Amino acid sequence: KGVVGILIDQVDMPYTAKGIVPDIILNPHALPSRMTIGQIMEAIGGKYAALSGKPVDATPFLETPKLQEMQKEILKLGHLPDSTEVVYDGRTGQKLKS
Amino acid sequence: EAIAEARELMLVHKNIITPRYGGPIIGGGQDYISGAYLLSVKTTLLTVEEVATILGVTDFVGELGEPAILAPKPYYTGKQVISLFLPKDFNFHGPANISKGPRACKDEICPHDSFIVIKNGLLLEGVFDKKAIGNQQPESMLHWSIREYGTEYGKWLMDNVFKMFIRFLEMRGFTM
Amino acid sequence: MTIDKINEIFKENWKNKLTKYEIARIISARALQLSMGALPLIDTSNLKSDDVISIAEEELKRGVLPITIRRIYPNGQVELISVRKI
Amino acid sequence: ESRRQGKLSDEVNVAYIATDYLNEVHINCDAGRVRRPLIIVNNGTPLVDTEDIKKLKNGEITFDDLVKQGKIEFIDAEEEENAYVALNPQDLTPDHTHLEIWPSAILGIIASIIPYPEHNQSPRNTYQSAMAKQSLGLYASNYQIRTDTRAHLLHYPQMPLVQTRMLGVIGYNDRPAGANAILAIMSYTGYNMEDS
Amino acid sequence: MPISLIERNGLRLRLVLENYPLEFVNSIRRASILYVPVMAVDEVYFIENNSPLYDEILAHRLALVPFVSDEALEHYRPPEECCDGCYNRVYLDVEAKDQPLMIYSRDLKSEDQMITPVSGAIPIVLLGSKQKISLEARLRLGYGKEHIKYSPVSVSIVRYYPKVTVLGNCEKAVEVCPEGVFAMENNKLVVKNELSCILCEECLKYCAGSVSIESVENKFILEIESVGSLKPERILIEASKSLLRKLSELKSKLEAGK
Amino acid sequence: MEIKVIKEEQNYLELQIDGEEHTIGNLLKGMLLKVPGVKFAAYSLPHPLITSITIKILTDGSISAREALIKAIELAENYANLFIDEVKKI
Amino acid sequence: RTLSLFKYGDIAPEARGFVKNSFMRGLSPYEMFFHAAGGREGLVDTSQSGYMQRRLINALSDLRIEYDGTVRSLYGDIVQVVYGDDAVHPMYSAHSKSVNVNRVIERVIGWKR
Amino acid sequence: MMQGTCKISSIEKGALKNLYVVKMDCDNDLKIEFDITKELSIFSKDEEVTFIISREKPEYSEKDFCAHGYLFLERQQEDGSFIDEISLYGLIVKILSKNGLINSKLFKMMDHVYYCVKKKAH
Amino acid sequence: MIIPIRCFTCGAVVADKWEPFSNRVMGGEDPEKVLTELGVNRYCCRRMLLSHVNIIREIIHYTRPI
């Protein structure tokens, strides 16, 4: 859960080498103490579902496809398997080091 | 009279130290600590343009001095940039929070940046983390700065150096 | 050592020093009577802010205020402190 | 056996309690008991076989037909004292008496919308259920001809790309209450710190 | 300080910029979004609306429809120098008889024939039986700095110029690169699409000694994608003209103070 | 835009510009950093909710800060004009 | 037995709530049940604290520091001859210490030590 | 104020990610090791080089390694040798000597010095 | 209710590709191939079409009288 802190225009958002811009930015510090791995898994599964056009089932104990198959298919469709992107700053144009 | 009393006795920066114990109740949080660690680590090298980008969020105007590295390329250091905001007679020796594990050496000769050394307001060793700038940490470097230079200095320091940490996280990129 | 050495140190320390409550009281009184039509005792021509509280603060910082603090000790002794150029 | 053959009511449950001191038989047939269904296995073989599944898939029989044939039974909490249940068919033993139909049927309808719920800490799964009842979407298809004291309407609802099997059963894909956002996990400008 | 064309494919334009600073190229990238005028719906006058969609929803949908504006930047007054010569009128009057009817962008009639929707197959609203709509909208030029409906592009990208060098030979590079930069030609590793490299460095953690990846310091790659209102080459010129206007105004105000 | 001077000297200038944002500030800072005689140059956007920037220039005294700003503006104008000329022939 | 999935009288670690998987690998159905059971009592987690603070406030509200250095009530009763033992405010303390002498030494000769 | 000719002996990794340690053997029973990163790594493991430590700025080109810092530490060991440390604003230069830098009256505590290493293969 | 005119992330127009995509996918074609043929290459624009729910069809039977 959270509250909206600021609204940023598309020019000021960080963009990937394809020009894609995030709709929402989440702080990495909210994850490690709450231990919600399902959210990162859902992000990867959603990117796979949008890239491949194939159904994604996340029913507990019976998930199909598995994460490794999802990552291999993400790689074959033109993206990095670990779901990371090369990102530039929209305000200055400089590439982030990570 | 009410406005004058509120401005003289209740202003925020006059109440940095809590009356429950002799310690600061105002200090760094989550991105501040990791940004300080990433900036103050000894592997961080910066160019003139990156230094100007980092210092543009502060009130700093003046001479940067010479870069720490002159050849083969001119590079600044994160410790060198941090040192611009420490008083020129401040001294501090103490361990860092990251020194819980085997990297602890308990002396100034540490290859892990686990021991903080400040001499004449120059950060020569160690990193900045929860035990140096974190809130509710008594007898920390920030606590000694506030105690020996005034709460106005603490207000100036929190409004200038803590923005640099966020800006450096923005430049470096921090994800999970 | 009248009663204890700590009490003597206390009274010697606060002999020529103003507490924060006295500063707040002086500033509030000066601002209240300055908003009522009194003439400022400083230039007030090139000051950053022209409100009464800022002028009172600047008038206290450079001693021009003819105000005296009366400290009444519990045994009846009276101490007088002047803020006019100390 | 009499209950499974249709000569007794399905509302009757029986448990046999044997101890070093107690030797009792308990029969319950009243109202208000919460029961759950299970597949009956015999000598390590469930009574639901390939032919029954084939007849179920093409629409010849239903769940009620499997119940009336003595292949699935609803048992209350006290009859289950004699039950040795297996989650999956591949861990069956001649000592087992029942088999679970669906291992994910231990959850409710709102815990059934969480993707990968077994990878999250449990209090977050509990907070999700509270927050899922406060979201805005489409609550009825005929909302424009109703007269509710307070009501909301999301203009452009989307159905989740990461799905669960229960989302299509309950009709949530036709009445959704959210949208899919491109999410980045990074520290930016300091405006997303501590739950922002 | 030249400009080299990579590809021109429909609404996309990709260029190589040499001897330009990154500050200028990023300023162009931002100005092509923020400071290029485009015709768009400003307000709508409703006479009747029985549709399932409310007046504000229909107004927003109409405002998000692109219009061809190439000839409108010389016959209409831009929002920087604020009726005839300022606004254009577009009409819509539809009705369904007995079965549901879908309203498209070809049902919008413009009083001026050079300002038309980019595509005529955009679904506006679905009408039920006997429902009707009759409205009138006014279009004016505007900048994306005011509302994103006035932006002429969709994506605007500037990225570093890559330098890919094959040192040895390894089959893992073809496997691990997400951009398809490498290929196998006669049992050896070759570079096919060097300019498609995004400097991922994923190849350096597997083919550590076989591949070298660097970026050229003085070169940059610029991608923009038009939405339909203006052609990609006009946007890049309008952005620079806006930058020149702002710079000249600032210079005049500075020189009028010393 | 509307400008005003916060603090000006022969080798220092703090200028506030209203109605401008990153597009002009970053360009001006980058152009200033390559003017000979400028020792320090930065731009600041005090609040993202306000469209206003602040320019801060420090020189060694061989050139005025205002002169350096005008030179940077001239450099940016030359780059823009050359870009316009070169885009028309691709 | 806790659940019907286990044998009568089984007290093995898995039967009584030991989870050998991680959140990265995923929990079993009964492991998920055990984890949800373990964290139930944190969901329950003030009137007593408020009452105690109110009683303290009403007991202590009339005490004042005098120009003598004495702690007295507004009715004149003496509570402490000198506040604390050295008349040092905890807000100005060096974490309960009036002076940290090691800190003073570090302030003076820390640049050569 | 302190020169020498010496040969690199080893280049290891170190505790941190991109850190590197260049160990060196000098004349007069002197040993020097200093930290570098990938940007500054311009040294091979068996080459002859020349160093200098002085309070004045030396003459350097684009092919050398020049830095300035502060001499902030000196300890004496059990055998009578000394440990000296220069901090290039974070990067540590450690010097092994038998007489020390301050004990020999060459430098003072907390002097600002210049550290330059040049290749003998001009 | 009805397909959005533009993608939420970028400003690309997606509303005019809904009818061909949905008509061809219910005809038995592969959604990824249809999306690639239509020119929808970024996953931000593909999630717009892969997750749309057509509710206006159900709502036109219950429109407010006014």
Ligand code: F3S
């Ligand atoms: S893996 Fe891929 S795109 Fe660039 S740097 Fe390495 S090649």
Ligand SMILES: [Zn+2]
């Ligand atoms: Zn260590």
Ligand SMILES: [Zn+2]
């Ligand atoms: Zn898109």
